Ligand binder design. Structure first.
Ligand SMILES: C[C@@](O)(C(=O)O)c1ccccc1
Ligand SMILES: C[C@@](O)(C(=O)O)c1ccccc1
Ligand SMILES: C[C@@](O)(C(=O)O)c1ccccc1
Ligand SMILES: C[C@@](O)(C(=O)O)c1ccccc1
Ligand SMILES: [Mg+2]
Ligand SMILES: [Mg+2]
Ligand SMILES: [Mg+2]
Ligand SMILES: [Mg+2]
Lengths: 357, 357, 357, 357
């Protein structure tokens, strides 16, 4: 009855006002693939994917354009579509870029379902829209720029910031944390992200120094696939270890949570498998007693976290603000869901043309 | 001193004389990406990648063409190159198609190193070339075609065949196995591959029936990422459970072997990370006491298994025979390594032009 | 094609400028067995073994002279040779002095392979030569001599020293550490080695006092074969426990790492099985997330660590400097690999004659 | 008061009437080192060591001759001597040939203690001499010679034989077992020894076939250091897995028994550390509920097993019968301890001269 009738993708490389500097490199632009999923009902679902590096951008678009053939004329039923794509990519490996592509389709298909039923996505999922507390996410900025951006964030109403660390010496890490505490006072949340840059001995040593400074969480201290090494770092800390942005699918989260790798989780809506993957991740987090935050994709994440029983923080990191209307607002440090059908993504069509690859 | 000076890729879609039918679909053609890695020494390394479905072919080529920029002018040092690519794809996710691309570069770079030193790859790795026992790999062919191809294989000298199973009823699975035993006698090896098609209860029930028929191994009875479910099936069997073709990198093998998912392993040279990933996988298999076979890539696998302490079987499944010279020969059911520098892959240039995508 | 044609060994007992004093005894001279492995290609591989005590020197030479018969006329293929010697010493026990002898042959055979191909060993193994940070290793020297040698080491550019401890009273241990920190300042690395001299209760008590002084690592606090006791000491510490110099073969390391005995590893190139044993140990250390350092054998270890993914520190302890040319240089506290075929060991033939046993 | 005053060793290579053929090689002669330990009391202790291969014979003698210096003028107190040698070989590695040498001294020192006190060793250890059931140990002899030697053994009164297996095909293994059962009837014990020749899958498959034939135990099915692999084979069998001949010291037995590698143990008096190592091994076996047999050294083992709470079988395999008087007798399949001071070893001095190396 409602069928998918087409899929269109556009690759843009959008400039970021502040380049996201991390201990392992800087993301200077946002390579995005914008997706339009057309339906027989005359509504169009929308989502975008984040390619991380321009090196993977054209490849991800090509893959989605070659996948269009298998979903056109399929019913608009995201849960049924996901099971079919899992099965078709059986042998190839339903992970990495293939999984990320399948999640962009899922996300657009749920946006289209909410437009067919004229309802906000959070309401379609059975929950009320509520304000979600947000922290402002900045990068490995050195003492002065990370302190300047942190003062700006408390002035816009945010109650927590995330800074990037993992400098050559532990002392540079603590300098940054201390200068931020100095400026924002003891009330404020300071989250720190190591971006997989340390080995386990080094991470135990640096994290116990940071724990004495009062940080909110320590994020991905070592290689992300090393769940056992994260459990070993976590076992020596009172402060929570946070991870999850790099889990591809609920099945990688299930393996990390099973061995107790972390006390907090932050799935990425694209890598976890879209809305379908998020509902499953959310059920796991509830049973393992894990507070759950989001990573990127703030527009759909404000909807998904209002439906997440152990919802914890939304990450504000605006990667697509240039090509979409600002329907998501932040008020007093909280994201406010727009009262729009679906997810509330509206393309700024003439900006897109400027950034086209 | 020896530098990489260029990378060229060509995507072909080659016809297979017998389409590889599996319980989850048929691979009717081989989508391959042929790689030429040029060096300052005037030698060219060669490898190919297998894309599994044509849907992923152009995307994988595009990715390799966009990656060329980061390895041109780097020293021809595969172990150092791999650590650098692992680090650059840190945030994106060093798995799936990205990992597969990086492995094609590794494999071509080791072929080029062996050509610089005028030595067969097995000798460069410090071992003697030896004949490696091979089994012939056929598909979900129904009773009559799988029995016909099995008689042909014993006539060419092979001592074991792999058939695909996972039919609607257990009885169809046993019919195929029985008709093959009937024709080849009790001496012959019959391996069976379920290609992830069963759930754990179903796999315990079918595998104990097959075990009473005397099969060599039962391969991937359930979803490949489910290592715990494979351990649960394995715990109820005397016959070995075989898996490993879908592990991306030695770190996924390490996780499966740690929980005792299988009694046999068969890494895929491309998914395990190339020659660099194979040497690491081989060290793990030796310590866990796991006999190690290969999956696809018979040309480089004959070299890698002669250097593998618990080497077990080579899988004969010729996906690129149309576009490369037959330097790998099978004699009395054993692969014989060619006495050629590197890996011994020589393009049949006018065939390639016929299959170009 | 390249065959081993002879093996010659010479036992020397070389004077050490500073006798290596440990909590369980002093190594006053270096009992070494120098090995020359002749090949049909007209190149000669070189290695030496360290006998620890003169009591074991003539026995180790005799063993190698009696083993010559089984490797002469075998192909120069170290990985194939190792599997054959493992098999021949099956019943006797492939450990202790037999394993150490087999490793001297491995090391000489890889040096000869690199000379056949005119390439540095690190390049033959597929990696780039890079500077490796080194620490200077001194002994149980008492407060004043260990402080004097530590000032000398920071003056030669080293950024860390290893001192020996395990005095009758904990207070003597801390005095030594404190006097060194006093002299070199808070930036410097101080590693401490107990040389198996404590029982587990005693080691928990002394290590938590040393941890409050800021040492880099605590090395072999109790009996080396007691992996469980090391795990019990490690579980009570933030500082890493270091061990590994006494593991014979990758299979003993595999057992220690499996139960989590230590957070750092330092295999000995001879006891771990030579270059072949090192590549396997290196794959294990990477999967268990263990930073890996070396023990003795600085010349070949500078090559092996440049090829080791979790490479951590090189131990400078020059046992054979009197009978080999100084091709290994230390610059700004880092070992610099010589640009010589193989390993770069060149006998000083008239010195050898002075030390001959 | 009683001091050790000298140590003398003689290396002989004695012909064996039946060469001990195993799946990994044949022991055609017995390379032995005969030890004479002189004391201030005017008594001389005696023991011999078994070198397994002539390749290790001269090296083991040399080592003992170089160790003489550290025990001459020490009190004749084996337990105190062992702790001192453990400590002196701290750094070198108290295992392999060094451990085997130290055990030859222990065994001679306990023989000398029993001669000082004019008492049989079993009585000095606090137990009564009792007959110990013995099995006759033969080799990989093929169907006809292993059946001929098994009939001879039942005729001399033995109630069990050990045969060697591990032929190219399982069918050859069962042929040998069946032909022996045929000849000796269903009452007789048939033990089988694989001598580490199988991998774990292969060992599960062959052992369940042998278990259906009724063998007494399956001995060392896989590599001896692989305790986990033995536990995995054992977990699939009703018949006991037997091992222990290759444990060097009670600390290796402790590790194997801790993970449940076997249901039966057979320490070797030399590799376990002599009489001192045997008393410790015996305490471990009792607590883990492990029936304990011996391996080789029948003369001292008849004494040690009469003092072993879970004593099970003595292995008859006469390696030194040519150079020692037959004071150990077998009567109705049981070893009968001689009523002689110490261990009852008396050199046949003119035979020794014939076999001298
Ligand atoms: C810093 C990061 O790890 C995060 O948590 O926000 C991140 C990684 C990659 C791209 C954007 C953001
Ligand atoms: C059947 C298979 O699982 C195998 O093991 O060969 C296989 C899967 C996919 C492509 C080729 C072969
Ligand atoms: C002190 C030591 O344990 C080390 O780590 O260097 C060592 C032990 C034995 C000989 C040389 C060095
Ligand atoms: C066969 C054997 O394993 C045994 O158990 O007796 C053995 C091994 C080596 C020498 C003699 C005997
Ligand atoms: Mg992050
Ligand atoms: Mg398969
Ligand atoms: Mg040390
Ligand atoms: Mg035996």
């Amino acid at each position: 009855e409602v069928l998918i009738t087409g899929l269109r993708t556009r690759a843009v490389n959008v400039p970021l006002a502040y380049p996201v500097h991390t201990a392992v490199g800087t993301v200077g632009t946002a390579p995005l693939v914008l997706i339009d999923l057309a339906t027989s009902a005359g509504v169009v679902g929308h989502s975008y994917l984040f390619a991380y590096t321009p090196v993977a951008l054209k490849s991800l678009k090509q893959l989605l354009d070659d996948m269009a053939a298998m979903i056109v004329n399929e019913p608009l039923a995201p849960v049924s579509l996901e099971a079919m794509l899992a099965k078709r990519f059986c042998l190839a490996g339903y992970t990495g870029l293939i999984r990320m592509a399948a999640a962009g389709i899922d996300m657009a298909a749920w946006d289209a379902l909410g437009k067919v039923h004229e309802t906000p996505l959070v309401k379609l999922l059975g929950a009320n829209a509520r304000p979600v507390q947000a922290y402002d996410s900045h990068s490995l900025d050195g003492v002065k720029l990370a302190t300047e951006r942190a003062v700006t964030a408390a002035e816009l109403g945010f109650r927590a910031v995330k800074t990037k660390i993992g400098y050559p010496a532990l002392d540079q890490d603590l300098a940054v944390v201390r200068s931020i505490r100095q400026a924002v006072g003891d009330d404020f949340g300071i989250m720190v992200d190591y971006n997989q840059s340390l080995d386990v001995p080094a991470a135990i040593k640096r994290s116990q120094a940071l724990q004495q400074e009062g940080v909110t969480w320590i994020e991905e201290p070592t290689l992300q696939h090393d769940y056992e090494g994260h459990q070993r770092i976590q076992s020596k800390l009172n402060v929570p270890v946070q991870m999850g942005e790099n889990w591809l699918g609920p099945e990688e989260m299930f393996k990390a949570l099973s061995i107790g790798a972390c006390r907090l989780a932050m799935p990425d809506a694209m890598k976890i498998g879209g809305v379908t993957g998020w509902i499953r991740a959310s059920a796991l987090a509830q049973q393992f007693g894990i507070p759950m935050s989001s990573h990127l994709f703030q527009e759909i994440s404000a909807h998904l976290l209002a439906a997440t029983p152990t919802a914890h923080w939304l990450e504000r990191l605006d990667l697509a603000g240039s090509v979409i209307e600002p329907t998501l607002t932040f008020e007093g440090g909280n994201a406010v869901i727009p009262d729009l059908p679906g997810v509330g993504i509206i393309w700024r069509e003439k900006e897109i043309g400027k950034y086209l690859v």
